[PDB]
Every structure is written in C-alpha cells, then in structure tokens.
Amino acid sequence: WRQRSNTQGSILINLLLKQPLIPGSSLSLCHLLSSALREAQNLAFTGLNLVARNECSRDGDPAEGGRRAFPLCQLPGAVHFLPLVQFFIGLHCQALSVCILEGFSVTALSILQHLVCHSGAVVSLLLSGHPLLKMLLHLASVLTQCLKVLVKLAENTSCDFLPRFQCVFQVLPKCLPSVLLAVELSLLADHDQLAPQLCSHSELLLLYMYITSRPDRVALETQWLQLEQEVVWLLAKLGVQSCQCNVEVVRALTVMLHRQWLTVRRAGGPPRTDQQRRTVRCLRDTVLLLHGLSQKDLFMMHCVEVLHQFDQVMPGVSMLIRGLPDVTDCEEAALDDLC
Amino acid sequence: WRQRSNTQGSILINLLLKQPLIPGSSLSLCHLLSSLSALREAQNLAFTGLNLVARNEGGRRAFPLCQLPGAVHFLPLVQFFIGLHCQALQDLAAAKPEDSVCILEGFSVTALSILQHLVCHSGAVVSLLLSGVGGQHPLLKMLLHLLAFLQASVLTQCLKVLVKLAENTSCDFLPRFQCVFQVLPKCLSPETPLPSVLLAVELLSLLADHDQLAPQLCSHSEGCLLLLLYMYITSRPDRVALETQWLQLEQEVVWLLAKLGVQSPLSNCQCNVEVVRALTVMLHRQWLTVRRAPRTDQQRRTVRCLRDTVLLLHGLSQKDKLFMMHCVEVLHQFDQVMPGVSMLIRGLP
Amino acid sequence: IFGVLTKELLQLFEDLVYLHRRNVMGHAVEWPVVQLMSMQNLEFIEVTLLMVLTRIIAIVFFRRQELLLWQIGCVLLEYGSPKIKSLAISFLTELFQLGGLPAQPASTFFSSFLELLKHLVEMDTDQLKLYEEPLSKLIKTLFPFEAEAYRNIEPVYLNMLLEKLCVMFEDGVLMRLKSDLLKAALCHLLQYFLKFVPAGYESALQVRKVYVRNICKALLDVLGIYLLGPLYAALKMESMEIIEEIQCLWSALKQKAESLQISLEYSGLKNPVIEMLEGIAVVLQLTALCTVHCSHPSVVITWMSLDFYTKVLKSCRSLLESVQKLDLEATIDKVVKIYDALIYMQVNSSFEDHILEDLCGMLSLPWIYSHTTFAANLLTLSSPQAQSRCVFLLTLFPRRIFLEWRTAVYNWALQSSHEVIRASCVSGFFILLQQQNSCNRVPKILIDKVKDDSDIVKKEFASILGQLVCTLHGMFYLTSSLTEPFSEHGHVDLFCRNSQHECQLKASVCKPFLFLLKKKIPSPVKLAFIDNLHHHREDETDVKAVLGTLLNLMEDPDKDVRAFSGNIKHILESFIKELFVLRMKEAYTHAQISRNNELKDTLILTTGDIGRAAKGDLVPFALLHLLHCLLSKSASVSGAAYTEIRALVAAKSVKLQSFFSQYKKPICQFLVESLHSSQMTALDVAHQREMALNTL
Amino acid sequence: LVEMDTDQLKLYEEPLSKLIKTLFPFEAEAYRNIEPVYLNMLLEKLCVMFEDGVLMRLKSDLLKAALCHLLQYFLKFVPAGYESALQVRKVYVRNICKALLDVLGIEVDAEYLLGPLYAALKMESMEIIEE
C-alpha cells in the first residue's frame, strides 16, 4: 500500500478540494475552513493533507480482525481532519446566513465517510468521543446522509464495539426518499451480533406501512428494491432473533407483489432494464420471503386474510420465477410449497 | 522515477496545498486557489490536475521536473489565476481599493511564486512557457507584461521563476527571453531591494546561458547596459542588504563577476573602472575581517570571499589596461588590500 | 581559457554520471566505457575525481551552473555506498555552505537526507566507519544552531524534518544502540529544530507538542538501561518549554525519574549506578528549570524536593559504601559528581544546614586530610579532576561549617599541586572565600605561594584575576553560575560560569599578580591576562608602573593580543598623556631598531586605537606622527594612514571638512611645521615641493 | 488488462470485458453509476490506451468491441458529472479521436471500429448541436 493506497484517500480529500468540490458545493472544505481555533484547525487540515502526501497513513491499521472486514488504512492525521470536523460541529452550533455550514457540514460528513473509509482507528476515535460525532448523535436529507456516513462507520466498526455505537445513539425514536434512503438500521442487521434485543420491539410495523405507502414521489423501482432489501435485512434480523405487524409488513409486500411478476408478464421480456432486473431479483427474494413466512408459521392464518389477493399475483409469479435468472431454487421450493 | 518520482510531485503539490505556504499569505491554494465561472472551472481543473499529479509519479533536464498533461492543465489553471493577476496589473495602471486589487494580484503573484516552485517541480509547465505564443508564453507574455509594470518583491519572485526556468530552459529559450532583459536592465534600480539585486545576479547568470545575452557586454562603458549595472554592483552601497546578508549579496555579485571572466567572450568599459572601485569596497570588508583576525559561517565565507578576491585580482589587472592607474585611485585601499591579503595568507591552509 | 577547459571537464564528468545512470537502470550495460572498464574501478576513479571536484566547485562558483551537478550529486549519493557516498555528500555540503540549499534539488535533496535517516536505523558498524561524523556535521550545518539557514529552511523541508522526527527516537532507533558520532548527531538533530523551536509554522505546533510527548518517550531512549547529555540539554529545553508556557507530561517525566529512583530503591545495584547518576545529571538542570527558570510567581509550583533528593543521595552514600574497591572508582567519581550536582541544585541556599554539613563530609569522601560530623568515623567507615571536584565541593560551601576549615582546605589545595589538582588549587584559591573577597585585601594565597603559578595554573590565575583585579572587593551574588545554557559538548568544569569592575586599587595594591603578567612572561596566550580589566584613583607613579605593563602589552608577543587595543581604550575612558607620549616614542624607537613592517603595523593599529579612544588633541598629535609615517615611503604609511584617518573619523563622529578645521588649527600648524622640516632639508626644491603637495 | 491473462485472457476474450462494460455505466450511465472518486481519471488510465486507439495492436477484435463499448462509455462520459471536466475531455479524448481517424485510414471494414465511428459521429454531432 504505502503511497499508492495514500493517493486514493488523498483523491477523496481532493474531491472536497475540487471546485465546487463534490456535489457542487461552493466550499472546498479548505475553503470552508477559510474562530482562532478554527483557523488552527484549517492549519491542521493542511497538515492532514501533508499526512496524505506522505502515504504513511496507507498500509496502516493493518490488522483486519473485528472491524470493517479487510483492514482500513491508518489514515494518520485523520484526527487532525477530525479536529476540523469538530470545528464543523462548532459551526451552526446555535441552530443545533442561517445554517450556511449545514451544506458544508454535510460535505464534511461525506468527507468524514471517506475519512472513515480512510482510517479504522479514526472510526475508533469517533466511537471513543468522535466527541463531535456524539454531539451530532445528540443533534434534513443531509442529516440522513450523515446517518448513512455513520452507517459506513458502523461497517468499519468492530463487532460489539459497533453494538456500543448503537447504544451511543440517544433514542430509537431519534433514529426514526432521502429518509427512505436512510431507511435503506439495515447496517446494524449487517453488523449482526449484539442489539438483537434492540431489534425486538414493543408493539417497524409503521415502517412496513410506509413501505406499503410508497410515499416517496420518485417511487423508483430500484428504490422500492432497496426498501425490499431493508425488509429482507429485517427478515434476516428476525432469524438472528429466533405477528400482526409482520402481516402488515407482508401487506406492504403484497401491494408490491401484485405488481411483481404481473408487471413482468405485461413486459413479456427478459429483464434487460436494471429496474426490471431488480424486480426479477425482488421476485426471487419474494419466493425466499414466502419460505421465511413458512418458517415463521399461525403466520399463515394472518397471511390467509390477505392471501387470496396475494395468490392471484402468486400464480403468475410462480411461472415468472421458474423463467427468471434472478429467481433461485431455495426461493422456488417455497413457491412450489405454495403451489 | 516510480514511487520516488510520485513523492517529489506530491511534495510540489503539498507546497501549493500549504495555506499560505508563502510567508505573508493568509492561504496558498484552497480559498486562495479559487468570466468568474471560467476561473471557477479552472479551479476545479486545478484540483483535477493535482489529482492527476497524484495519479502519475542530463543538463537540459537540469533538476528533473515531472511533465504531465495534468501538470499542464494545473499550469493552465495557474495561467487563469495569472490572467486574473495580469488583469489586476492592468487595473492598477488604470487605478489612480486599488491596493486591495493589487493585494489580490500579490496573492496571485505569491500563487505564481508557488507556481514558480511548481515550474521547478514540473517540466511540463516550463515547456509550455518555453513554447510561448509561438517564444515567451502568452501566459508567459502576460508575466512579461507584469514585469513591465510588495509588488516589486513579486516581480523579483517572477524573475526568480524565470531563473529557475533558465536552468531548465534551453539557451535558445534564453534568447527568446533576451531583450526582456533589455527592459529588465532599465527596471533594475538602486532603490530596488538587495534580495531583488540577488535576482538580478540570477538574471546575469541567464545572460551567460544565452549567446546573444553573452553578446550584450559591460565593455563599451556607459553605452553598454552591462557596464552601468556593473557600476551599481561596484558601488556596493548595499543599503537594503544588512550585515553578513549584505556581504552574501556581495558574494553572489562576486560569483557573477567571476562568471563573466570564466566565459570565453569575457574607460572603454565603465564597469572595468567600477570593478577596481568595487574591489576596494570588498577590500574594506576584508580590512574589517583583518581587524577581526572562521568559526562564523560568514567568517568562513569571508575567507572564501578573500579567495574570490585573489581570483578577482588577476581579473582586475585584465579589466583595466591602466591596472596601476585603477590601483592609484584605489591605491590607498590597495595597500590596505595587500595587508588584508597577508592576513588572508595566514587564513589560507 | 580555464572555462573552456572546464567545459571539457564537465563533459567528462557527465560521461562518468552517465555510466552511473546506466548502473542505476540496472538493465543493459554499455559495451564500452572509455580502455578496460570495471564498475567498482569506475567508482574508485570517481572518488579521486570528487576530491579534486570539491576544490574545483569553490573555483567553479557558477550561478545556475552548479545546483544541477548538486542535484546530480544527490542521485550520485544514492549510487554511492557508505564512505564513497559520504565523500560526495561532503563535497555537496561544502557547496551547500556556499550556495545554501539549491531550490532545484528541492524534495530530492530532502530525500537524500531521508535515505540517510533510513540508513541510520539499520547501518553496519563498518558502514558507520565509512559514514562521516563530518557528514553528520553537514546535516548539523543543514539546520542552524540559531536561525540562519534553518530560519530560511523550506516548510516542505520542515515536513521532511517532521518525517525525520518519526524516524530515529520516535522510531525508537535512538533508544537502540547507535554509533556515538551518529547518536550525537541525532541529539543535535532534535536540538536543531525542536531545541531551536525555529519557525514551526510548517511544524505541527500544538500537534507537534503531542509529537514532542512521543519525542519524550523517545527521549528516555535507553533510559534506565553523549547525545543523552546533549538530550539532557534537550530534555532541559523541554523543561524550558514547560517554563513560561506553564506561566499564564513533565510530571510524568518526573514520575519516570521517580521510576529510576524506584530501581535505586529496590537496590543500590538495581539502579544502574551510572544510570542513577545520569538521572542525577540534569537534576541540577531541573533546578535551573522551573523556579530557577522563573527567576531567570506564587512559588506554589514545586521543583523536585531537595529532601527526596537528599534521601536518594543518602542511598547513594550507602551505595558508595556498598561499592567494592573494583566497583566505583571512575563510576564512584560520577557518584561524587552527582553529589556536586546536588550542591549545584542547592545553588544559593542549601535546603538543609545538616545536609550542607553532610556535603562537606561528602567532598572529602574518597580523599580527605586538611579540613565534619563523621570526623574520624567517616575515615573509619572505609584523580586530578576528582581532586578538583572535591575542591569544588569545598568551594561551593562558603564559611559556615569549617569556615576556618575552608581556609585550611585552600592550604590543602596549596599542599598538592600536580596537573589539574595544581590547576584545581589555583581555581580553589580564587573562589576560596566569597566573604574574603567582599573585604578588600591583597589576594596573596596561591598567587603569593608560587611565583611561577604553574602554566595551566597561571591560565587559571588569569581567570582568578577576572574574579579579582578590576572586579571590586564588594561582592554581589558571589556566584559565577549566572544563566549558562549549554557549552556544546564541553565538560561542566567550574560549577558557576555564566557595568564597571564587580560590585580604589593601587597598582602597588595589584602588586605581584600585576607583576606576573609581562612581555617577558610567556603568555601565549595573553588570554585572561587582560582578565577583569578587559571584560562597578590617584595611581600616579603606581599608574605609571601599570602603564609599563601596558607597554609590554604594546610590544604584544601576538599582534592580535594587542586585544590590548580597545580593551585598553575602555580602561582609558574610565597626567597619563606625558607618559603615554614617552611610551609611544619608545615604541617608535623600538620599531626603528626592529626595522620590521609587521611590528610597525601592530604599533600603527595601536596608535589608531589610542586616538579613537582619546577624546583629546594630544592623541590627534600622536595621529599626526602617524601622518608623518604616511609621508614616509616603503608602503603602509599614507595608504595605511588614509584608512587610519577614516578610522579616526569613525571614532570622531567627525564633521569631515568642518571636523578638519577643529582637527587642524594648532595641529594643522604642527603639520605645517612637519612640511617646514621637509623644507628645512629638502635635499628636491620644486620636485621636493611636488611630493609634499601630493602628501598635502 | 490488455495483456494480463495472456492466452487465458484471450479465453475470456470479449466476455470478461463485456461484463466490465455492463458492470459500470452500462446504457444507464449516470453520476450514480460511476464513482466521483474513481473520477474521469480512473477512466483516463484506460483512456490513454484509447487515445492510442491501437485496435490492430489489440489481440482480439471482440476485445476491441469491449474497447468500442469503452468508446461508447466515453460517449456516456460526455454529459455533466462530478469528477469530469468538459475542457479536460477535449484535452484527453482528442488523441483517441486521432486514433479513430487512424482506424479510418486502414480498416478493411469498420466492424467494432464502425461502432467507434458512430461514436466519432457522436460529440462531433454534439458540436454541430452547439457550435
């Protein structure tokens, strides 16, 4: 790694640096840095750029055990960038012209996500509290993006330590399109281990109702698939853990299901379209979902009240599934059981 | 090449990155780095060029400077900044506020000085300057226009950039450069600062590089441009230069005087008469050293200066047909110089 | 003609570089490099070429035509191995001193330094012999002791230095055993940027201070298990950073010192006896640091306790009893030095009077006699420098316990006078009583005891003369320590080193010590013979006797020691003229008998100095005699005089022609009289007049 | 990639490359499809070979067809995206345009090159659309 690994992180620093940097923001991040401590943080940022130049941070944090799969680079001087991030936390503090930093702050968070990719240790420093990250947890779409950067941080975070990070967020309600992207949480299920009890609830179903709603205006087929992937992650979470709310999530799935397969039948085509290919993957997932529902139970009786509408979509889907490349035999076996 | 080559370019990028890496500059690159939209596009391009420099790591080369299409693109972004500085210089001529516009040009000039460092760092930027409009670069031509116009220090830095280019630059490129010198001799002033005078000595080095510059000569006295500049060097008032630093500027001048003699081509000349007076001024510095009678780096330099004087003394006899006559005007000093020479002999090992 | 030859030589140099470049590629090798070519043989030819080249480079001195060879030289250095690489680096360094650092070498020049840093962590001892301490000195040259080049050093270069900081002690390579010349260089390197604290806008600053804490872990290095004394000065610099910066980690370092104390606590043997001594070393520096440093607010902040230190010394005193006769010896001398350090730590005030009495017993420790609670029992319990250190411990005590004993100890110093111990006695006599100095009396003592005073001891006597002589009997502080920083690698030697003279003296009152300095006296050097006078009435004939000593100075065995000039002028500023004029006439007569220009030159410089110092016409009249010398032929004379007249003007703050009317007048009439003397014996009429007119 | 697997690379031939073309920016393209971080430059390292446009140098015409797909990717690259500069693209994809003229100079049939020629028609057509 060494310098060659360092360049990729530096390029991420460059993207914030590039006019209007990344996302068309006017600030270069260094430009955003342009009180006395904040000026010192800007000096620190130049030093971090100097750290990027050395390439010392790359080929750093070598052990891959526990956190972020294959090991992240050391990203030494990530903390100096973090001090600049703390300065970003200081900007817009009164809110937490007006909120001018927010757009810069979101850019800083995106840079922070690149930094999180850059250092496994830097993620550890944020977990220790960092402290600014805890303040961010204490405090719109950019905020949803910041949560997504946190989700990348969670993937970086080692198991159990990540559970501690889930503990760090102040409230499940506080965690509760761009919001839909934030829903597509799923990372915590991906970080399987502790917090299974947190996944267990009191009455989730409301989120399933939102999936039934298809509220986001874009209503992208890929976006729907991402919601479906989040539901699949929830299904995986339920298996790790070991109802009427589950039926309500099923009801949202059914509204998607009647369109699924029948929409494919109307197309009468192999799913060349990426959304069409995504639908084919979703149909295989639905067959897998049916197998999961069979594993759950009781569950079938709740399924039965909405079952007749589901079945009319299902018979066409079963023919569609055998044809589809995305559909798989284990999902198909559940479909055969439905047959 | 390989990783080491990439690092050298990265260090050059790092110097641009430091804000203000130049002393007296609030930021270098960054907010300093960035039609207004065309300039913004150039700033985005410059970030891309730095990324390109990150992506990719005997005499004519001189110090090797990496040449990149991306380095050229970064140079083009630098040229756009230079154009804004050049526009500021035209605005200053219009101006009769203006200092703030000048400060922005100075920021760019500091940026150019980083650019000059970048030019030493990258072969491609120098090659673009070498190509010129068709000659001096059109971006280079704008810099020449700035030369025609803190601002003086920026001009000295630009001259330093030309000198760095000159070691990289071919003798022919120096000939294209020549006559900028013809205006430059007019530009040089007793009022202008000693660091700028050191830059002028670098300009003298540039004259050695180009045969046409070599053709311009101290000989022909006042009519010759070189003799008048040499006469200013001979006076050695060095009012801007301070203490050892004043001596160091003099030491650089001594190296330049030595260089003309080393060159095969080099009062009939005003400068040769001035040089005997200049030798006496050096002798006065030597006499102060003799009174001290070289732990100090300057003191070691003074011993080096005395060795330079010994080479100078053979040259001084060559400079004036009436070598004795030059001595008679400087002769009371010359007797002191002989005493200094005896002290120097004790110093010599 | 040389330049054309040089151009051919440069092409030959380029061909050798090209052969190196082909080797650098490491792929295809050119069939012909000439003759018979061996790559090692070519390197052997190149090393000889470089030494000639280094002389040639100074001779070259060509702008825009030298850095590229220097840039080539760093690449050549990478090709070069060990000493062969080092000699080229040294040639580059000499060029570097003349050219500072080339802009073109830029990062690559820094890279060459970086390669050396990589080399230092894993360098063969045989490779180290090839490596040059002077090459390390050139690295020392690269960052100035003050600001200089380091102040002008590139921020990017500073970043390379920061990378260097990660290398070595941050690496822990510095803790790892290293060749001493390299280790001293490493200590110098921390000093060059960190000790200077120069610049640092490029440097981390507050981030750097955290790096400095990492550097502090590096600073312990071998620690409990040279540069460290240099580091100890560097550690003192870290303490200096705590001083003032605290005013508006060191405690952990104190804890680390406590851990070394804990090893001593487990056993006297358990503390390395030398290592415990090393911890004791710089304890005085710690005393200088913090509250001493604040002296030069609340005092709530506490320096490491003297009582805790005294207990450690008591453990040390037990350890010395513990040490075998084979054990201790020079190491024991180091333990005594630590006891001396404790006395330095006490500085103006001993923490304990009983501890001070213990210290007097400690000074005798290995050898006693002459001038004690232990008394016979301390003898019962069981080096020229060591004797001097024991004398120093007695010197540090003034009066108090054994105040009479201290006079007896001075007698003991008189009793043994061999080598340093004879020298040690001479230092002891000068510092024997701070109180005795305050009362005014002839010093006598050792100076009275030996007329010769030894030769090294005589140099010590000159140092004693600075304490006495011009310095007044009344005593302020009574401490010579002042505020010393670090005297390079020099041994501490005397514990204390760093407006009119010192806080009426007859020339007869000076008596023999004044007598001992003489033109006859060997001197070589006059050295501290100028002493106190060089650096707070009615002498009359005695003043004339002092003037005769000044006349011996005027003869000057060394013209440079005449030294007498200016230092004498300051004394003059503080009846003499008739004697001075006679002395000048005698000097001229002596000069004529010598018939030597160099002797005359020393006199001419002296005459000029006397005039510059003088606020009176008679010195100008002396200048007029020099003007008569200016009339005289054989060179020097008027050309020397014109410089002298300018020198007279500089002291004069003269009005030039307006000054000249004041300058001339009756003196001008004297000048006319000198012209009249030429008229009296023209021996050339109008031709004689023309030569006079040129003088006019 | 042009010579990484040797004969085995020949065995993958167009398909390993075709999978790569499908994998990034295939038909849909978009800012989302291509990472800003890979940037125009990640495309550019492939692009310098494209500027050479050595289809004859390339072992497989089908591999060239994947390269032709890459030329289509260059057409996809034209658009407004983060990490892409239009002036930079003219600076970069100008030699590749010269390479296409070279392919025009010595081709028995346009073939995969014919798709590149349509790509040559593209952008040149865009300049007609603007300038």
mmCIF file of N, CA, C and O in Angstrom, chain C residues 117 121 164-175 186 218:
data_model
loop_
_atom_site.group_PDB
_atom_site.id
_atom_site.type_symbol
_atom_site.label_atom_id
_atom_site.label_comp_id
_atom_site.label_asym_id
_atom_site.label_seq_id
_atom_site.Cartn_x
_atom_site.Cartn_y
_atom_site.Cartn_z
ATOM 1 N N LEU C 117 18.464 8.898 6.894
ATOM 2 C CA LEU C 117 17.645 8.588 8.093
ATOM 3 C C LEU C 117 17.265 7.105 8.048
ATOM 4 O O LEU C 117 17.334 6.443 9.104
ATOM 5 N N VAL C 121 18.829 3.826 11.018
ATOM 6 C CA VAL C 121 18.132 2.817 11.872
ATOM 7 C C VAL C 121 18.846 1.466 11.716
ATOM 8 O O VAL C 121 19.010 0.766 12.739
ATOM 9 N N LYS C 164 11.583 12.983 9.633
ATOM 10 C CA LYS C 164 12.833 12.575 10.319
ATOM 11 C C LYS C 164 12.483 12.339 11.791
ATOM 12 O O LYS C 164 13.054 11.412 12.389
ATOM 13 N N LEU C 165 11.601 13.169 12.348
ATOM 14 C CA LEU C 165 11.221 13.048 13.778
ATOM 15 C C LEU C 165 10.570 11.677 13.997
ATOM 16 O O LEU C 165 10.875 11.050 15.027
ATOM 17 N N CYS C 166 9.743 11.223 13.054
ATOM 18 C CA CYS C 166 9.134 9.871 13.154
ATOM 19 C C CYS C 166 10.274 8.845 13.133
ATOM 20 O O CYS C 166 10.181 7.843 13.865
ATOM 21 N N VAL C 167 11.294 9.089 12.312
ATOM 22 C CA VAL C 167 12.489 8.197 12.222
ATOM 23 C C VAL C 167 13.339 8.387 13.490
ATOM 24 O O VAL C 167 13.071 9.348 14.243
ATOM 25 N N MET C 168 14.274 7.467 13.752
ATOM 26 C CA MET C 168 15.150 7.575 14.952
ATOM 27 C C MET C 168 14.349 7.457 16.255
ATOM 28 O O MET C 168 13.715 6.422 16.414
ATOM 29 N N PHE C 169 14.414 8.431 17.165
ATOM 30 C CA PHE C 169 13.817 8.271 18.523
ATOM 31 C C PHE C 169 12.302 8.024 18.486
ATOM 32 O O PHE C 169 11.850 7.190 19.298
ATOM 33 N N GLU C 170 11.537 8.690 17.618
ATOM 34 C CA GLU C 170 10.090 8.343 17.547
ATOM 35 C C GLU C 170 10.040 6.875 17.113
ATOM 36 O O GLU C 170 9.204 6.123 17.653
ATOM 37 N N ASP C 171 10.921 6.487 16.194
ATOM 38 C CA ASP C 171 11.048 5.068 15.759
ATOM 39 C C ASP C 171 11.476 4.244 16.976
ATOM 40 O O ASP C 171 11.042 3.077 17.069
ATOM 41 N N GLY C 172 12.296 4.808 17.868
ATOM 42 C CA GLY C 172 12.898 4.042 18.977
ATOM 43 C C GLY C 172 14.252 3.545 18.527
ATOM 44 O O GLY C 172 14.926 2.855 19.320
ATOM 45 N N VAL C 173 14.654 3.910 17.308
ATOM 46 C CA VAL C 173 16.028 3.590 16.823
ATOM 47 C C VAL C 173 17.005 4.332 17.747
ATOM 48 O O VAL C 173 18.080 3.776 18.036
ATOM 49 N N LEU C 174 16.657 5.560 18.150
ATOM 50 C CA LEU C 174 17.543 6.371 19.028
ATOM 51 C C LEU C 174 17.726 5.640 20.365
ATOM 52 O O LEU C 174 18.862 5.634 20.883
ATOM 53 N N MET C 175 16.660 5.035 20.889
ATOM 54 C CA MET C 175 16.785 4.233 22.132
ATOM 55 C C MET C 175 17.742 3.075 21.825
ATOM 56 O O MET C 175 18.567 2.741 22.702
ATOM 57 N N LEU C 186 22.122 12.772 16.179
ATOM 58 C CA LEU C 186 20.665 12.623 16.411
ATOM 59 C C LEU C 186 20.228 13.597 17.510
ATOM 60 O O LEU C 186 19.167 14.238 17.354
ATOM 61 N N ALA C 218 10.694 8.948 23.306
ATOM 62 C CA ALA C 218 11.937 8.739 22.533
ATOM 63 C C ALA C 218 13.104 9.242 23.379
ATOM 64 O O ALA C 218 14.185 8.621 23.346
#
